[PDB]
Amino acid sequence: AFVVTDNCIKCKYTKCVEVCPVDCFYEGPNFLVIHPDECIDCALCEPECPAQAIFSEDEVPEDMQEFIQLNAELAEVWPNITEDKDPLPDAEDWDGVKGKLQHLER
Ligand code: SF4
Ligand code: F3S
């Protein structure tokens, strides 16, 4: 599975969903997650993320290991997103700010 981590929050560019062959991204108000059972690890999304927030599970940074379980949990409750849309209004002000998990919205 590929995993969306911290830098997506408050950015949510949605470029990643274009390239997904199996449509396994699920949408939250200010963040996206990958459903781990559905992802086929084709890795096509992680060049596309402008926030460089997507990682192969086995490459998730040590300080971001919570995101693996979080993607699994939230994928079950959020709606499937299959079309990209516009980025959040202020996405590049937040691009690269650290510690954005305290701002996640369910
Ligand atoms: S690795 Fe491939 S299948 Fe998994 S989320 Fe990214 S684009 Fe979709
Ligand atoms: S910012 Fe988030 S919405 Fe997709 S394009 Fe990067 S993982």
Curated annotation (Swiss-Prot):
Region Disordered: start-end pairs: 83-106
Cofactor: how and how many bound: Binds 1 [4Fe-4S] cluster. Binds 1 [3Fe-4S] cluster.
Segments forming domain 4Fe-4S ferredoxin-type: 1-29, 30-59
InterPro entries xref list: 4Fe4S_Fe-S-bd, 4Fe4S_Fe_S_CS, 7Fe_ferredoxin, Fd_C, FdxA, RnfB_subfamily
Compositionally biased region (Basic and acidic residues): 95-106
UniProt KW Translocase keyword: no
Keywords, ordered alphabetically: 3Fe-4S, 4Fe-4S, DNA-binding, Electron transport, Iron, Iron-sulfur, Metal-binding, Repeat, Transport
Binding site for [4Fe-4S] cluster: C20, C39, C42, C45
Keyword Electron transport recorded: yes
Superkingdom of the source species: Bacteria
A molecular-function term among this protein's GO annotations: 4 iron, 4 sulfur cluster binding
Known cofactor(s): [4Fe-4S] cluster; [3Fe-4S] cluster
PANTHER family linked: FERREDOXIN, OXIDOREDUCTASE
Role description: Ferredoxins are iron-sulfur proteins that transfer electrons in a wide variety of metabolic reactions. This ferredoxin could play a role in regulating gene expression by interacting directly with DNA.
NCBIfam families: FdxA_Protbact (NF045490)
Protein name as it appears in the record: Ferredoxin-1
Species of origin: Azotobacter vinelandii
